Scaffold this active site. Structure first.
Site, PDB file in Angstrom:
ATOM      1  CG  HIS A  45      -3.149   6.604  -0.240  1.00  0.00           C
ATOM      2  ND1 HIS A  45      -2.024   7.296  -0.630  1.00  0.00           N
ATOM      3  CD2 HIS A  45      -2.994   6.139   1.076  1.00  0.00           C
ATOM      4  CE1 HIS A  45      -1.227   7.249   0.423  1.00  0.00           C
ATOM      5  NE2 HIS A  45      -1.743   6.535   1.500  1.00  0.00           N
ATOM      6  CG  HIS A  91      -5.362   5.329   7.652  1.00  0.00           C
ATOM      7  ND1 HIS A  91      -4.241   5.281   8.472  1.00  0.00           N
ATOM      8  CD2 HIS A  91      -5.544   4.188   7.032  1.00  0.00           C
ATOM      9  CE1 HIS A  91      -3.764   4.078   8.330  1.00  0.00           C
ATOM     10  NE2 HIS A  91      -4.518   3.364   7.457  1.00  0.00           N
ATOM     11  CG  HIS A 113      -8.778   1.191   4.304  1.00  0.00           C
ATOM     12  ND1 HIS A 113      -7.934   1.222   3.216  1.00  0.00           N
ATOM     13  CD2 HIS A 113      -8.000   1.236   5.453  1.00  0.00           C
ATOM     14  CE1 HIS A 113      -6.743   1.314   3.650  1.00  0.00           C
ATOM     15  NE2 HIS A 113      -6.680   1.288   5.014  1.00  0.00           N
ATOM     16  CD  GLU A 152      -7.123  -2.108   3.800  1.00  0.00           C
ATOM     17  OE1 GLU A 152      -6.477  -2.108   4.851  1.00  0.00           O
ATOM     18  OE2 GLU A 152      -6.800  -1.745   2.634  1.00  0.00           O
ATOM     19  CG  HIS A 183      -6.672   0.132   9.364  1.00  0.00           C
ATOM     20  ND1 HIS A 183      -6.546   0.122   8.017  1.00  0.00           N
ATOM     21  CD2 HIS A 183      -7.463  -0.944   9.758  1.00  0.00           C
ATOM     22  CE1 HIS A 183      -7.149  -0.968   7.605  1.00  0.00           C
ATOM     23  NE2 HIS A 183      -7.745  -1.638   8.620  1.00  0.00           N
ATOM     24  CB  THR A 208      -3.707  -2.887   3.899  1.00  0.00           C
ATOM     25  OG1 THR A 208      -4.034  -1.553   4.160  1.00  0.00           O
ATOM     26  CG2 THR A 208      -3.874  -3.726   5.119  1.00  0.00           C
TER      27      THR A 208
HETATM   28 ZN    ZN Z   1      -5.135   1.367   6.656  1.00  0.00          ZN
END
Ligand code: ZN
Ligand code: HG
Length: 255
Positions: A60, A90, A92, A102, A115, A194
């Protein structure tokens, strides 16, 4: 769970009822409603002694893991009480440059979102921090498309090695300090993870000032796979969760 239509964020509530909690993340940051709190101390980021170990494709996202057996890289000061240790970071990102983050500012979305995850060391390990309301500390850093970020290229070059889910590669001598913006001005509120389990143990610290990255840098992200090797290829893009209801919570500004 995933980010698809059949396993997307809108279905997480069935396995993770907490998805409908009272302090869910992410949220939209209304800069006019945000309340400037004078009693907010400056952020204290100490990553000079940081020790990265490896990069992993967990299906993911891709995680850069650090050695947290000691107070090597710590996050303190600010809204925080005590020391928090850097365990991993990581991102997003989106399919396009118009989405990926996010968190959003005045409803605006960025290309991506970095993050950096920290756990409250009085709890001794990561696994115990998730059981506490003040167990985690998250550093949110927004990414915009513009000029290349030099300190991000090491990461971008290794991605070919962890193209598919399960893959990992050694990733030592990586300095996270090359990923921070110039200013440490932030917004802070009580939230959660999240991604499932979606535990509501996180203290959000979203930095005002974004970091720019080049279109070719962000493009390497989008070449990753959700799928495992030998399976139909599903590109790892739009691995972000839609903003949730603030629900009475208050977002405070250090500026
Ligand atoms: Zn994250
Ligand atoms: Hg918790």
């Amino acid at each position: 769970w995933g980010y698809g239509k059949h396993n997307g964020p809108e279905h997480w509530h069935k396995d993770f009822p907490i998805a409908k909690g009272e302090r869910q993340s992410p949220v939209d940051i209304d800069t006019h409603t945000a309340k400037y709190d004078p009693s907010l101390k400056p952020l204290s980021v100490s990553y000079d002694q940081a020790t990265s170990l490896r990069i992993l494709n967990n299906g993911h996202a891709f995680n850069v893991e650090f050695d947290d057996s000691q107070d090597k890289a710590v996050l303190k000061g600010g809204p925080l009480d005590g020391t928090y240790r850097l365990i991993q970071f990581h991102f997003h990102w989106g399919s396009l440059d118009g989405q990926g983050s996010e968190h959003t500012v005045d409803k605006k979305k960025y290309a991506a979102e970095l993050h950096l995850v920290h756990w409250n060391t009085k709890y001794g390990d990561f696994g115990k921090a998730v059981q506490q309301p003040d167990g985690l500390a998250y550093l949110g850093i927004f990414l915009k498309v513009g000029s290349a970020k030099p300190g991000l290229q090491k990461v971008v070059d290794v991605l070919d090695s962890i193209k598919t889910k399960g893959k990992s590669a050694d990733f030592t001598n990586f300095d996270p300090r090359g990923l921070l913006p110039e200013s440490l001005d932030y917004w802070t509120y009580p939230g959660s993870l999240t991604t499932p389990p979606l535990l509501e143990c996180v203290t959000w610290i979203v930095l005002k000032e974004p970091i720019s990255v080049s279109s070719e840098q962000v493009l390497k992200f989008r070449k990753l796979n959700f799928n495992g090797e030998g399976e139909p290829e599903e590109l790892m893009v739009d691995n972000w969760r839609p903003a949730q209801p603030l629900k009475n919570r208050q977002i405070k500004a250090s500026f």
